[PDB]
Write a protein that binds this ligand. Structure first.
Ligand SMILES: Cn1c(CNc2cccc(C(=O)NCc3ccccc3C(F)(F)F)c2)nnc1-c1ccncc1
Length: 414
């Protein structure tokens, strides 16, 4: 449980924050806990007069106490109750967990350092940590975002949004293919996920049904940023992604690309939701070269059963040239949102998750490392791995123990 430090911490914490120019209206009011304590004080022009009277008051003393807790966060496994496995991968696995002090539920992505070392995957693990931190502000509800990162002697841990509903690869195998109306629901939420990423200069690259997870109500998020990169710094030129869901720019060896690659992948994926395979698969051939050449040379071949609105969308998303493709011409994601396929969608209500999802998940049922040492050199690579997202910890506290602990602490101090 969270124990606030005694209110004699105030003067030291105020000097700490003043020296970093963080005792202003813009810095404190924008923070969630800063907003609530300022809101609480006002019930007891605002940039000058009101703000400094708040600084003298012990509602700012309380803000300094919570801030002190924030800055001393040093998570270990001991701070989480880890329950059961809800995902697997090459370097490790994902568990459902409860953070002990607040009781908030999260997904813990636990990667094993010995398995990482053995597969020379150090830069990939660091990359997911970097990519997650870029996309994890703004509390976007259509990406599986990070709140904390930390590591132990033998593990890396990402603390991510919990998704108990399973992925769309799995659900395709049970549900079968989706109708246009049902696909539209997933497209609308996935589009907003990609918009949030593209704003922070992140191209996602691995968009496919397996990376679209469902919550217990059936709303979806883009999951796993291991193959994403920051295209602003240098445009990537590597063939990254999944065969059948890669754009022509990505496949063409040498050619640089940006966010454009995702909109092509969206086309591949939405088709897959309707038809059960990538549009460049043809006869379920497992020949990956046949799949890539069909992508590069031959224009996309759509079945006649598709509505004229859906043809416009897919043909637009699957244009082989970036200069013809939806979401690449100037206005970005907004070009896709304006497609005739989404005529009847209010994108505020998509964002607010008001539309009924077409699949509400049912209920689930219930070595290599031997030899590899872990040197000091290996631990040095993860020196800057630990991280806390201020917004996230504050939002967690706000929705769980803020009022209770504030009340408890007032009794200790009165
Ligand atoms: C389903 N799920 C995945 C799927 N991916 C996954 C799961 C477990 C381990 C790994 C993994 O070992 N990834 C290694 C890897 C593989 C390719 C590229 C980069 C990286 C990494 F960054 F992890 F090094 C991946 N990741 N997070 C979830 C998940 C998130 C929230 N709730 C439920 C599940």
């Amino acid at each position: 449980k969270i124990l606030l430090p005694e209110p004699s911490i105030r003067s030291v914490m105020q000097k700490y924050l003043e020296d970093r120019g963080e005792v202003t209206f813009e810095k404190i009011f924008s923070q969630k806990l800063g907003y609530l304590l300022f809101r609480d004080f006002c019930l007891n022009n605002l940039r000058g007069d009101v703000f400094q009277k708040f600084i003298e008051s012990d509602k700012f003393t309380r803000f300094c106490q919570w801030k002190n807790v924030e800055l001393n966060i040093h998570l270990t496994m001991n701070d989480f109750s880890v329950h059961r496995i809800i995902g697997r991968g090459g370097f490790g696995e994902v568990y459902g967990c409860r953070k002990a002090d607040t009781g908030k539920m999260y997904a813990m992505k636990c990667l094993d350092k010995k398995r990482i070392k053995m597969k020379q995957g150090e830069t990939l693990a660091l990359n997911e940590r970097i990519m997650l931190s870029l996309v994890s502000t703004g509390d976007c509800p259509f990406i599986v975002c990070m709140s904390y990162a930390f590591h132990t002697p033998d593990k890396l841990s990402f603390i991510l949004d919990l998704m108990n509903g399973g992925d769309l690869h799995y659900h395709l195998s049970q549900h079968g293919v989706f109708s246009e109306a049902d696909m539209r629901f997933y497209a609308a939420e996935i589009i907003l996920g990609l918009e949030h990423m593209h704003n922070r200069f992140v191209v996602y690259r691995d968009l496919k049904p397996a990376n679209i997870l469902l919550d217990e109500h059936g709303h979806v998020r883009i999951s796993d940023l291991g193959l994403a990169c920051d295209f602003s710094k240098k445009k990537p030129h590597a063939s990254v992604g999944t065969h059948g869901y890669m754009a022509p720019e990505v496949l063409q060896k040498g050619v640089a690309y940006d966010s454009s690659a995702d909109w092509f992948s969206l086309g591949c994926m939405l088709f897959k939701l309707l038809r059960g395979h990538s549009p460049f698969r043809q006869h379920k051939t497992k020949d990956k070269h046949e799949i890539d050449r069909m992508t590069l040379t031959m224009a996309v071949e759509l079945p006649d059963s598709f509505s004229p609105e859906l043809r416009s969308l897919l043909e637009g998303l699957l244009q082989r040239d970036v200069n013809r493709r939806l979401g690449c011409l100037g206005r970005g994601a907004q070009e896709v949102k304006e497609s005739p396929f989404f005529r009847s969608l209010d994108w505020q209500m998509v964002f607010l998750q008001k539309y009924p999802p077409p699949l509400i998940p049912p209920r689930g049922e219930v070595e290599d490392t031997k030899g590899i040492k872990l040197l000091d050199s290996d631990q040095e690579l993860y020196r800057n791995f630990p991280l806390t997202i201020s917004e996230r910890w504050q939002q967690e506290v706000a929705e769980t123990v803020f009022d209770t602990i504030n009340a408890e602490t007032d009794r200790l101090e009165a």
